[PDB]
């Protein structure tokens with residue numbers, strides 16, 4: 587099955603673009619973020635641990651998040667001809683462990699947005715949906731964390747040869763025209 591990594595900063599537009607991809611190509615959208623939040627909503631002690639980490643805007647340990655990705659992948663396994671892995675990997679070791687335990691990605695969609703643009707979007711979603719990590723201080727924390735840990739992931743897969751960059755400063759469906767182009771050329 588096709589495994590696509592979709593990687594980019596906070597509020598760059600990963601989720602948005604992934605759901606457009608689902609609607610058009612019928613890939614299976616797996617959000618590490620959605621998976622983690624669902625474990626939070628479960629009421630477990632683990633959820634309490636994950637909620638604390640996410641509220642501070644830090645990386646959840648590789649073991650937890652890779653576990654959930656693999657689980658979800660295995661569940662949707664008999665209906666998926668493709669997978670969109672949204673927001674994983676976020677550090678080089680995550681990409682390495684994914685490859686050891688699951689498989690190699692066909693493509694990495696690099697959803698590229700300016701830092702200020704990302705702050706603007708998250709600041710807006712913060713005032714509307716009231717996601718706990720969208721407060722101003724946590725945003726700065728998520729943004730710095732993206733620059734330090736997740737950018738080398740982009741380098742890693744550029745060395746692999748599979749990164750395609752899309753300009754996420756554009757209007758949403760102009761962005762998606764780029765995503766479509768990258769996916770069509772598989």
Ligand SMILES: Nc1ncnc2c1ncn2[C@@H]1O[C@H](COP(=O)(O)OP(=O)(O)OP(=O)(O)OP(=O)(O)OP(=O)(O)OC[C@H]2O[C@@H](n3cnc4c(N)ncnc43)[C@H](O)[C@@H]2O)[C@@H](O)[C@H]1O
Nearest residue numbers: 596597598599600601602618619640644645646673707758
């Ligand atoms: N692998 C991992 N390892 C360790 N920890 C992990 C982990 N994965 C998750 N975690 C933990 O989970 C937490 C949250 O991670 P996660 O849930 O993955 O989210 P995020 O990366 O912090 O960012 P968002 O999902 O909020 O934004 P987005 O890039 O998907 O864009 P979106 O379309 O949704 O929304 C963007 C906003 O802008 C709008 N928008 C989108 N595109 C455009 C456009 N072209 N023009 C105008 N507006 C746009 C959107 O409507 C929206 O309002 C992490 O902080 C971490 O603590």
